[PDB]
Every structure is written in C-alpha cells, then in structure tokens.
Scaffold this active site. Sequence first.
Site, PDB file in Angstrom:
ATOM      1  N   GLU A  35       0.827  -1.241   0.000  1.00  8.30           N
ATOM      2  CA  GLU A  35       0.000   0.000   0.000  1.00  8.30           C
ATOM      3  C   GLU A  35       0.836   1.254   0.000  1.00  8.30           C
ATOM      4  O   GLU A  35       0.536   2.199  -0.740  1.00  8.30           O
ATOM      5  CB  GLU A  35      -0.968   0.061   1.227  1.00  8.30           C
ATOM      6  CG  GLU A  35      -2.096  -0.962   1.191  1.00  8.30           C
ATOM      7  CD  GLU A  35      -3.120  -0.781   0.019  1.00  8.30           C
ATOM      8  OE1 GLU A  35      -3.070   0.229  -0.680  1.00  8.30           O
ATOM      9  OE2 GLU A  35      -3.995  -1.668  -0.142  1.00  8.30           O
ATOM     10  N   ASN A  46      -7.756   8.698  -5.749  1.00  5.96           N
ATOM     11  CA  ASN A  46      -8.527   7.675  -6.403  1.00  5.96           C
ATOM     12  C   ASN A  46      -9.267   8.301  -7.555  1.00  5.96           C
ATOM     13  O   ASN A  46      -9.500   9.541  -7.619  1.00  5.96           O
ATOM     14  CB  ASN A  46      -9.502   7.038  -5.389  1.00  5.96           C
ATOM     15  CG  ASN A  46      -8.788   6.346  -4.257  1.00  5.96           C
ATOM     16  OD1 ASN A  46      -7.838   5.654  -4.488  1.00  5.96           O
ATOM     17  ND2 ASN A  46      -9.238   6.547  -3.007  1.00  5.96           N
ATOM     18  N   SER A  50     -11.807  10.712  -4.237  1.00  6.48           N
ATOM     19  CA  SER A  50     -11.412  10.463  -2.891  1.00  6.48           C
ATOM     20  C   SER A  50      -9.857  10.232  -2.877  1.00  6.48           C
ATOM     21  O   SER A  50      -9.204  10.253  -3.917  1.00  6.48           O
ATOM     22  CB  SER A  50     -12.173   9.226  -2.358  1.00  6.48           C
ATOM     23  OG  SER A  50     -11.738   8.040  -3.026  1.00  6.48           O
ATOM     24  N   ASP A  52      -6.435   8.223  -0.605  1.00  4.52           N
ATOM     25  CA  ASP A  52      -6.069   7.218   0.347  1.00  4.52           C
ATOM     26  C   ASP A  52      -4.884   7.803   1.133  1.00  4.52           C
ATOM     27  O   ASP A  52      -3.998   8.410   0.535  1.00  4.52           O
ATOM     28  CB  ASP A  52      -5.518   6.004  -0.360  1.00  4.52           C
ATOM     29  CG  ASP A  52      -6.591   5.092  -1.007  1.00  4.52           C
ATOM     30  OD1 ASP A  52      -7.803   5.287  -0.845  1.00  4.52           O
ATOM     31  OD2 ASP A  52      -6.167   4.135  -1.691  1.00  4.52           O
ATOM     32  N   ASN A  59      -9.081   5.178   2.848  1.00 10.73           N
ATOM     33  CA  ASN A  59      -9.827   5.994   1.876  1.00 10.73           C
ATOM     34  C   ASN A  59     -10.755   7.011   2.562  1.00 10.73           C
ATOM     35  O   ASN A  59     -11.586   6.630   3.374  1.00 10.73           O
ATOM     36  CB  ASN A  59     -10.654   5.022   0.990  1.00 10.73           C
ATOM     37  CG  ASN A  59     -11.238   5.683  -0.238  1.00 10.73           C
ATOM     38  OD1 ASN A  59     -11.366   6.891  -0.301  1.00 10.73           O
ATOM     39  ND2 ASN A  59     -11.587   4.874  -1.247  1.00 10.73           N
TER      40      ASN A  59
HETATM   41 CL    CL Z   1      -7.926  -0.656  -1.931  1.00  8.73          CL
END
Ligand code: CL
Length: 129
Positions: A35, A46, A50, A52, A59
């Site tokens: 990640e 995203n 949105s 992260d 998120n």
């Molecule tokens: Cl994800």
Amino acid sequence: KVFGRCELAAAMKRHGLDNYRGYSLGNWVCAAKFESNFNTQATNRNTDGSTDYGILQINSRWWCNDGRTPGSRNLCNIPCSALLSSDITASVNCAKKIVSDGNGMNAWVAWRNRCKGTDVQAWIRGCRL
Ligand SMILES: [Cl-]
Ligand SMILES: [Cl-]
Ligand SMILES: [Cl-]
Ligand SMILES: [Cl-]
Ligand SMILES: [Cl-]
Ligand SMILES: [Cl-]
Ligand code: NA
C-alpha cells in the site's frame, strides 16, 4: 516517517494488530508494504476524487474526513491528516474498524492481490518482537 520492515512489524504488534480479527502480523506488514512502502505520509488520489492516506492507504470515501470528498463518510471519526502521523496509532485504530466491517482484509485490494494466499510469515521473519 518511512518505517523499516521489522520496525513496523514491532510497532503494529505493540498496537494490537498481531492476530487481530484472526490476521497474523505478516498480513498487516505485507499489506503496508504494497500500500505505502511503509511510508506514513503516502497519499494517492482515487479515480472518484477520494484520496487514500497513510501506511495502509485508508480511503476518505468512507473512513476519514479530508474536507474535499463530497458526499463521503467519516467512519473512523478522524481527520485524514491523522493517518499521516509518524505515530501509527490513528491508522491502526481505523484499520481495526475497517477489518471488523464484514470483508476482513479484502478491504485492501493490494492485500487480496499480493498477500492473501502467500507465505505472509516471510514478512516478519528475522525480526525480534
Ligand atoms: Cl484498496
Ligand atoms: Cl521490505
Ligand atoms: Cl467526511
Ligand atoms: Cl508508532
Ligand atoms: Cl475475516
Ligand atoms: Cl512479545
Ligand atoms: Na470522508
């Protein structure tokens, strides 16, 4: 803060993530690797607008407020900025809510695709814990 592998594994363990909702520690370290590459300041926007945040790329659509995700929720009741701190507490507590929500670690698409079904114990090998 960019964590080292064993450093993060120890910090996640201190924060109660080893075997949380039945997920061994290596799951959590593997998820953070893919990640964020263990960087607490990691952010990525995203497709839907949105963003992260943090070591587990939590998120703003559902989990935190960043003031710029219209119509979203804040299920962890935190500012998204909290998730970028060198102190992983906020990320860990929010991850605990997320993994408790019905879908377990499949919430992290990188965990499903890269960690699930693999030797995740490799991720904590050679660490003192
Ligand atoms: Cl994800
Ligand atoms: Cl590594
Ligand atoms: Cl929000
Ligand atoms: Cl910490
Ligand atoms: Cl589960
Ligand atoms: Cl111990
Ligand atoms: Na939000």
